[PDB]
Structure formats: C-alpha cells, structure tokens
C-alpha cells in the first residue's frame, strides 16, 4: 500500500514534470493574453454608449 502510493506520487510528479511544463511554458502566455483582452472588452461594454 505505502510503496504503491509513493509510486503514484512519483508518477504524478513525472507527468506534471515533462508533459505539463513543456506545453505550459508556451500556452500560459496566450491564455493570459486572451483573458486580458476579454476583460478589457467587458469593461468597455459596462460603460454607457455615450
């Protein structure tokens, strides 16, 4: 039980290590840019037309 739990922890560490980080280092920039732009447009639409 203990050994297999440790193995699951290790496996999760590896999966977050390579596959997640390699993609994140590029995808986070673009996702943040999209969030920033959509918040700007929401703030615009909040104001009245005039």
């Amino acid at each position: 039980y203990i050994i297999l739990t440790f193995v699951l922890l290790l496996n999760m560490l590896i999966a977050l290590m390579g596959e997640t980080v390699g993609q994140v280092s590029k995808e986070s920039k673009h996702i943040w840019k999209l969030q920033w732009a959509t918040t700007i447009l929401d703030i615009e639409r909040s104001f009245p037309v005039f």
């Binding site: 999760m12 977050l16 997640t20």
Partner: peptide, 11 residues
C-alpha cells in the same frame, strides 16, 4: 492563476 486552474482540473 492559470497554473492553479489547470493543476486543479486537468490532472
């Protein structure tokens, strides 16, 4: 924030 969201949901 993106990191926290993706860590919570994906894996």
């Amino acid at each position: 924030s993106i990191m926290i969201q993706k860590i919570l949901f994906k894996d």
